[PDB]
Amino acid sequence: DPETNMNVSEIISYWGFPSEEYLVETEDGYILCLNRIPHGRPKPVVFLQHGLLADSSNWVTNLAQSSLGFILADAGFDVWMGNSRGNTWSRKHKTLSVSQDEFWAFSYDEMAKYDLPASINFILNKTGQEQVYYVGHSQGTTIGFIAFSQIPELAKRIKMFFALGPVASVAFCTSPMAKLGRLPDHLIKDLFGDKEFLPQSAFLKWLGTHVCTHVILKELCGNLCFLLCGFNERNLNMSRVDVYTTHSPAGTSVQNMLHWSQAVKFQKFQAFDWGSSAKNYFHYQQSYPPTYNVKDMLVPTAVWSGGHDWLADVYDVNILLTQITNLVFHESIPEWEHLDFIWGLDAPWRLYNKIINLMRKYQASENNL
Ligand SMILES: *[C@@H]1O[C@H](CO)[C@@H](O[C@@H]2O[C@H](CO)[C@@H](O)[C@H](O)[C@H]2NC(C)=O)[C@H](O)[C@H]1NC(C)=O
Ligand SMILES: *[C@@H]1O[C@H](CO)[C@@H](O)[C@H](O)[C@H]1NC(C)=O
């Protein structure tokens, strides 16, 4: 497969689409790579945000008529895809080197606080548009829930929020992440260091111990993304595995994994606990981390969840839906697993078509004013 050892711009150009990349600088000096599909093979803007240990690839890794990024371009949208700090394409800084611990001293807190405002405000300036549609998967969902409840000036800029496999609280997840999560913070630091989260073969074998055993592929259990997220074999293109395997995982910090462990352990949707009153005060101007309330998020939201989703589990998803003021739509696809939202064979007709039609319903209402 030519897409395996290709960059995200090369994949877009391979499928016959216009490709554009942009370097954006955050308020805290990180240099993010934005991917753009300006037209199909001024238009309304859609911003696609990847999840845990992923990248822009996620929206352009199936075929031209089965990948969200590509179908949105063909449906008449100006497609923008974000890359979270620390991944393959966003591992540059104005001052810091990738060899310094301070470079990796971030979690999804900084992604929501600095990556999203910088990325969205760059787009709105470039296009001249006043608003964007926001689509998030997995961790991209939580970045949205934080950014849009914490930054009301940014929320105003969002027409509609499409949450695919939504994650706020991760209190009841049964994914191998709750296993890594329930280890003490000092042990995670001891095993993986203070920089990039790079687990070796022995750790992934331990994380995989009798949880990834009623699977045909099994090579998928060696992959960090497939392991933490979970895959539905009834709905994956098992011939495309090497494309998914090469592009994912795409990189994150040990601190981001520490934050996800704190989310499992404390069962609270909050900012990162730095370990002491003094350390927290140095970051938040208070001794305990600020809590994030989904009730403060007034953006019109459309939610898709999977009944067999390990990470964005049924129990946590049901709690979340009761907290979304202005829930426009919600659907639970009973057999879907976490990765089905981005790589499901049936995702174009059970998901991608509904997203396009809700955007058009919003457009019809807009054009009516
Ligand atoms: C499922 O995966 C296979 C393998 O990635 C896809 O087949 C490739 O499709 C492209 C575009 O049509 C061709 O250029 C390749 O030569 C095909 N073969 C291989 C082995 O890469 C297939 O189209 C995917 N999609 C579905 C829905 O089956
Ligand atoms: C992607 O590959 C193309 C072609 O080699 C190159 O021009 C571009 O700068 C690359 N982008 C990144 C982010 O590596």
Author numbering: 9 to 49, 57 to 384
Q: What text appears in the publication on this structure?
A:
Lysosomal acid lipase (LAL) is a serine hydrolase enzyme located in the lysosome, where it breaks down cholesteryl esters (CEs) and TGs into free cholesterol and fatty acids (1–3). LAL belongs to a gene family of mammalian acid lipases that includes gastric and lingual lipases. Unlike the well-known mammalian lipases of the lipase superfamily, triacylglycerol lipases, LAL shows a dual catalytic activity, capable of hydrolyzing both TG and CE. LAL deficiency in humans results in multisystem autosomal recessive disease phenotypes, WD and CESD.
In the present study, we have expressed and purified a triple glycosylation mutant (TGM) (N51Q, N80Q, and N300Q; mature protein numbering) of HLAL and determined the crystal structure at 2.6 Å resolution in its lid-closed conformation. The core domain, which constitutes residues 9–183 and 310–384 (mature protein numbering), contains a central β-sheet composed of eight strands (seven parallel) and six helices, three on each side of the β-sheet. The cap domain fold (residues 184–309) is a complex mixture of eight helices, turns, and random coils, including a lid (residues 215–244) that adapts a “closed” conformation. The structure also includes GlcNAC sugar residues on three of the N-glycosylation sites (Asn-15, Asn-140, and Asn-252); the other three potential sites (Asn-51, Asn-80, and Asn-300) were mutated to Gln. Among these, Cys-227 and Cys-236 (mature protein numbering) form a disulfide bridge (Cys-227–Cys-236), whereas the other Cys residues are free, as previously discussed in the case of HGL. As suggested before, Pro-241 and Gly-245 residues flank the lid acting as hinges, with the trans-cis-proline isomerization inducing opening and closing of the lid. It is apparent from the structure that the catalytic Ser-153 is completely inaccessible and substantial conformational changes must take place before substrate can bind in the postulated active site. Cys-240 and Cys-244 are in the lid region and are deeply buried pointing toward the catalytic Ser-153 (Cys-244 is only 5 Å away from catalytic Ser-153).
